[PDB]
């Protein structure tokens, strides 16, 4: 009946259309801040001197960008890893030129996404569920941390974090391949396996369940109406699905335990994306993909090129051109 206890009861209420919770108390403001600043920067922000070389990059729609090319541009290389809130700038004009909004957006977003993962634990506890859905979401979360926070820490500048834009993303990727040879890194290769396999098993599982739907409807209606929300009986025949898939390959290469199957579905892409988040996060410290440049030579010592050396030719052309005005000395050491 006390004021605080009533507040605690509303915060943690399972009757709110959207669950709030204690993580929500940090998540709601931080995400609103990031969202509002992003929408405005994406539409109207003036150009940003991302690389600190007084060469501003235009990112917003009103400065001649479309949806594909627009971006909120990372903060200036001259700032490096320094904290640059609004109140550290002589004016909003200065803060805009130097990339202020990128910092505001990504810090609020990393907080709010982190609280988003906590909120998944919290509601799960309020509803009497098992708790590990938040563990599945730590894979995309770790990946966002890697490209917005970890990689800038290792390279010494938020100007090398990933831009908040579609082409900006591609720029990040091409520069990353030139400097880290990420294609040749095992943790990226596991990421592709996590993401190709995820798509594969999504399609497989969806097709096997759909294939063994029990007839409940006429030809003139969507089979979807054969299932009613909250019915106790399963809506497909898992033995028929097992009997099809076990014969498509062989019997013991098929799941008949639904729990093992769905756990498999959870584990494969989650673990693969953990590794690819770790790949970005460890190339942040310049432990790069495999280097086989000139690994094959002949009896005389002539280099015999392989596909790896061709990759390297591509990598070099990305190297020599990126940030074409920003380098004064012969080694791009960071």
């Amino acid at each position: 009946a006390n004021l605080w206890e009533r507040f605690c009861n509303w915060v943690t209420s399972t009757d709110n259309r959207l669950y709030v919770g204690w993580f929500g108390v940090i998540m709601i403001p931080t995400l609103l801040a990031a969202t509002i600043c992003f929408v405005i920067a994406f539409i109207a922000a003036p150009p940003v001197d991302i690389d600190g070389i007084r060469e501003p990059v235009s990112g917003s729609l009103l400065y001649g960008n479309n949806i594909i090319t627009g971006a909120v541009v990372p903060s200036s290389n001259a700032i490096g890893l320094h904290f640059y809130p609004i109140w550290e700038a002589a004016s909003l004009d200065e803060w805009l030129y130097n990339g202020g909004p990128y910092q505001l957006i990504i810090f609020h977003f990393l907080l709010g996404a982190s609280c988003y993962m906590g909120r998944q634990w919290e509601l799960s506890y309020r509803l009497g569920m098992r708790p590990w859905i938040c563990v599945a979401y730590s894979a995309p979360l770790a990946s966002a941390f890697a490209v917005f926070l970890i990689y800038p820490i290792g390279q010494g500048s938020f100007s090398d974090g990933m831009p908040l834009g579609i082409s900006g993303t591609f720029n990040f990727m091409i520069v990353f391949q030139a400097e880290h040879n990420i294609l040749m890194h095992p943790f990226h290769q596991l990421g592709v396996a996590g993401v190709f396999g995820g798509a594969l098993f999504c399609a497989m599982h969806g097709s096997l369940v759909t294939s063994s739907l029990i007839r409940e409807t006429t030809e003139t209606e969507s089979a979807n109406y054969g299932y009613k929300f909250g019915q106790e009986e399963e809506t497909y025949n898992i033995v028929a699905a097992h009997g099809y898939f076990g014969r498509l390959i062989f019997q013991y290469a098929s799941f008949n335990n639904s729990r093992s199957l769905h756990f498999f579905l959870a584990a494969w892409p989650v673990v693969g994306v953990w590794f690819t988040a770790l790949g970005i996060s460890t190339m942040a410290f310049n432990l790069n993909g495999f280097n086989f440049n000139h690994s094959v030579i002949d009896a005389k010592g002539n280099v015999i090129n392989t596909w790896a050396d061709i990759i390297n030719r591509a990598n070099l052309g990305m190297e020599v051109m990126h940030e074409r005005n920003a380098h004064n000395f012969p080694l791009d050491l960071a």
Binding site: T14, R17, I53, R54, E55, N77, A78, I79, G80, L81, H82, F83, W121, Y125, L127, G128, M129, R130, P131, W132, V135, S138, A142, I150, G154, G156, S157, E179, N181, H185, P186, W274, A277, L278, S281, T282, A284, F285, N286, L287, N288, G289, F290, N291, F292, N293, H294, S295, N315, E319, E323, N325, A326, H327, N328, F329, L331, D332, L333, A334
Partner: protein, 442 residues
Amino acid sequence: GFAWWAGNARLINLSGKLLGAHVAHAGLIVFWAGAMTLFELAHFIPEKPMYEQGLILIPHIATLGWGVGPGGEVVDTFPFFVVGVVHLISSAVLGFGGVYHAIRGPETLEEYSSFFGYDWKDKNKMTTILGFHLIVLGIGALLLVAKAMFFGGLYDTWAPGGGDVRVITNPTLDPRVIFGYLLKSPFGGEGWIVSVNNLEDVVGGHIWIGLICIAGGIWHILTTPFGWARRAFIWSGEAYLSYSLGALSMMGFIATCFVWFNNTVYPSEFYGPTGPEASQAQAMTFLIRDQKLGANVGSAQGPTGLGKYLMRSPTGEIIFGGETMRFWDFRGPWLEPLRGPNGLDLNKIKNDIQPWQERRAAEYMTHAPLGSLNSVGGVATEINSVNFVSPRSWLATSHFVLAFFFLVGHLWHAGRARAAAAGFEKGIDRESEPVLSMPSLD
């Protein structure tokens, strides 16, 4: 009812066997420390820098002041041998005690001795075991103080004349300095505790931590958790494990940044230069070369209009130009002779650069912590030839990986401990599904 793949969860309420597991595991850690040091010594060549040799334990011992002399030159390898041997030998004793308690020893303890036996829900016994280890930890931190002040000192990369082993006679005690570090921002130019840049602060903080840990050990032996703490935590083995998992994760992330930025307690003489350091060193190298050719590096405008060799930071300091403008917070003993009140002094640059600084810059630039997984040194486009990956990259990446998984382990075990404590970790009771007794959302 655990499966074989969750088999160690069968030890939760078997204090005797669980003790053997921890002690056997402690043996593995001591074994590796011993075996690895010996492996590194057997491979060590004193004419090469440590960081051209894939060493991570010998630099930890050197940094304590054993085996090294002025400039980090290795003078005596016997202390390295001793540390490995003693660790290796001690692992047999822990190994022995671990397999005895895990196989032959009493399966549970609480019936054999009310002292060593424990119940996870016994908040008093738990905080007493906490207090014991806190005291151990405090003693451990004071050991580092004793070495620093009374048993030879520590390696000081900042020491005058190239760095040297130095005894610490005035450890910093001022709590405004010691805890000032805990309140510095973690961002560029501040860097929280990772910015500690002198052995006086390092030793003084260990005096403090040692006292605080012993104070807290005694505190937790003498008390039981207060009611607000009782109502805030889950009191169970797995919950306790999840708390430590969070803490180790956090500590792992911190150590990652420590080895990457800090060149004081990870001297670059031993570990190789940091990323910022190597990048600064490249700018220094071509400043030096170009000025010998007659270039006026103060007044050279680069392509962008910014200075080619020197420019200003956002707060005015004279700093190296190019991309390394990002690394201007870097401080290192080979560079600081050139700093004046406004940053790099152009008069010192024109007149006072010494050959040893030229050497050190050329060396660090050609040893930047970039390399491939198969230990090809340098940028990803470099051809094979140089077999090198900095110890800093090895130490930073490994511990980021471990720190990340332990955060995942924290989440896994914290959520399970919550669910197990409330009684729905094995699934939803069909006959009593909470959602089915809640009103609909709409």
